[PDB]
Design a protein around this ligand. Sequence first.
Ligand SMILES: [Mg+2]
Length: 265
Amino acid sequence: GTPALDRAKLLKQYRKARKRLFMFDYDGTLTPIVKQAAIPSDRVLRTLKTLAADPRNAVWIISGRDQAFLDEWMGHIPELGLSAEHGCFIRQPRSDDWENLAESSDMGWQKEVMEVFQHFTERTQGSFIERKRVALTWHYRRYGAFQARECRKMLEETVAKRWEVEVMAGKANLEVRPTFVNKGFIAARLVQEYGTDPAQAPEFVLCLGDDFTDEDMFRALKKSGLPAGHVFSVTVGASSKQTEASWHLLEPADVIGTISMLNNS
Ligand SMILES: [Mg+2]
């Protein structure tokens, strides 16, 4: 559990900070979860535009949403940093260049993953491989769970040992993906971009998200080296929710309200 976000504490550090960093998950955080439906309201867009208008602020939207979604709904706010398709497409603040991070990355790890995946596929009836530009996935929905543990172990003693890649399990599913698709990696990278000089660090960081993928960002900020009172990791959810975050807000409405308070600092 966490205490409710201390809004006075937040506002005070915001006003004091000369550089500020915002990292926002989209779905469930800036807007409610719904069953292409979750388009951003005018209020959300206006609030983000006003926040990004301040050159002291670096404002990032970090989403698994398709690149076209973020581009169409938020691209017109030029100061926003956009991360789409789980970290696969990035648009820096004030850049009109979308970058494809897969084509920048050495994907040489895929061959060895395919080798390990073929080994287990030959020994696990009904299993099969799915190949993407970025992620390689071993499906066993059709013993699976045990084989997946064996496979996970083999990937760890080989592929993961020499490639910046991480192993992710699904319900009946083993996926292997570059570290750059991990939100914690993305958050760590955003902070590291300010350099190692402590006087050039952001003095205010607000990091918001609503589910397990966002827990990685909160964990990453614990390793940032930033002064405790400078970082606000906030989960969107119940007060009783176990989280790596330090604070909670109950609903996306409370998120937008909180940003609105800052906009009026
Ligand atoms: Mg979310």
